[PDB]
Amino acid sequence: QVYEETAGVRPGEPVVGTGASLSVELGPRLLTSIYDGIQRPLEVIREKTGDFIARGVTAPALPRDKKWHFIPKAKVGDKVVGGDIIGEVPETSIIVHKIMVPPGIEGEIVEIAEEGDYTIEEVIAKVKTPSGEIKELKMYQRWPVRVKRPYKEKLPPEVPLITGQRVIDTFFPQAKGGTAAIPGAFGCGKTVTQHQLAKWSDAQVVIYIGCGERGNEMTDVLEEFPKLKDPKTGKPLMERTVLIANTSNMPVAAREASIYTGITIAEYFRDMGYDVALMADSTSRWAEALREISGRGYPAYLASKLAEFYERAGRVVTLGSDYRVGSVSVIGAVSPPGGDFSEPVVQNTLRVVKVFWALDADLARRRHFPAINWLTSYSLYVDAVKDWWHKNIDPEWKAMRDKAMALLQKESELQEIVRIVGPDALPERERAILLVARMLREDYLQQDAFDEVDTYCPPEKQVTMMRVLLNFYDKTMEAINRGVPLEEIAKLPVREEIGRMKFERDVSKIRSLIDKTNEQFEELFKKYGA
DSSP, X not given: OOOSSOOOSOOSSOOOOOSOOOEEEESSSOTTEEEETTOOBOOOOOOSSSSOOOOOOSSOSSOSSOOEEEEEOOOTTOEEOTTOEEEEEEOSSSOEEEEEOOTTOOEEEEEEOOSEEEOTTSOOEEEEOTTOOEEEEOSOEEEETTSOOOOSEEEOSOSOOOOSOHIIIIISOOOTTOEEEEEOXXXXXXXXXXXXXHHHSSOSEEEEOOOOSSTTHHHHHHHHTTTOBOTTTSSBGGGGEEEEEOOSSSOHHHHHHHHHHHHHHHHHHHHTTOEEEEEEOOSHHHHTTOOOOOOOOBTTBOOTHHHHHHTXXXXXXXXXXXXXXXXXXXXXXXXXXXXXXXXXTTTSTTTOOOEEOOBOHHHHHTTOSSOBOTTTOEESOHHHHHHHHHHHTOTTHXXXXXXXXXXXXXXXXXXXXXXXXXXXXXXXXXXXXXXXXXXHIIIIIOOOTTSTTTTOOOHHHHHHHHHHHHHHHHHHHHHHHTTOOHHHXXXXXXXXXXXXXXXOOOHHHHHTXXXXXXXXXXXXXXXXXX
């Protein structure tokens, strides 16, 4: 009935064309709302077996009945282009919904509604185009989900997207507008980590796509997600979120379209000037959308539209008369059918994902959390975001990061060698590298998502914690170079404080550990001379 390819010639079966595309309606009831892959609202069902299960039913994506408060931000006579913000609507206690001229419309505002309460079908403005056509603007707009929402310019990766998780921000940074992947494999704290990312990343709006990887995933979404609170405001997280759902019972077509629906809604909040995080966990439900197309995508080339999906991520100068910037960053769950990867990252094009956080079950079982393998993870955005860190937070950010990574790489080499020849023949220098590498692992990489302080680590705290550790490293190598025994260094009281600094809120108290470290090594130099 509705199609991408234009219905000129009529095919066999009885099918009535609509001269329209598969589209979404945009705002201002997108927030707090739960759809399927074609933006049909949710249908709650009786428990019966399992706990809960849902299906999409044909109905309006946005309520026509509710009255929204419109504040005008333009006047009669103002010249206007696509993306220009002609009003505002408090959609939610956190998010102001910006009402924008649809793309491809420009001209003079000849009529705009005064401040008041209106439903979304009400015309709140009229624009006269250069040819004199009068266009009626409402509080919502439609867009075809399979077409990039346009923008002026895609900016190169530059600003990090602060997650507040030390291992990510320091070693494997995501950029605002960037593309990241995480394994879908269960039993390694993926749920804690995705949860932390949604809650703490400095995006104003979150779009979450998957909700049916487990049999009892729908019930957890419907029951718990309304209880979850945005820790930055104290208000519900649902109030800055939009949920899309993919399940075994929903049709194959809806789930294929789900990522396009999601990223279109993301692009729409981007266009307002917001930073948006699009998070996809529907990988197994999305993957089984693979279908028999026995006739006549093809053996010539695989489904490379997944490249074009990830291609829609980015930070952009948006449409509009004012200079304005917004972003969609993508964090997607990926998984192998078998145990080994089976070439899933090299399957899709030539590495469209620029960041990979390798959740690792062995790390999980050793209680190292978050369980991100610091040897198999990568980010191609380290050089792209370093200047932001250098200029705003710490001039030595990249140098410290590289130095800490080098120590971790050395640690890994030594542990392998030691596995063979034992630890007893290790020189002091080597033992010192292992001591400090262990401190890096325990005092910096490991982070406690369940702790009131350490659930989030501000940029300033990250660099200060790093300086403390690397200053301890420098002093350690300086000390053994002067024949101070490593047993003595391993027993320095300040080590104990460095171990707990992650639980300290006051960054100045953490910073003072540098001097405290520097004056206790002196009490060792006094005990051993020179």
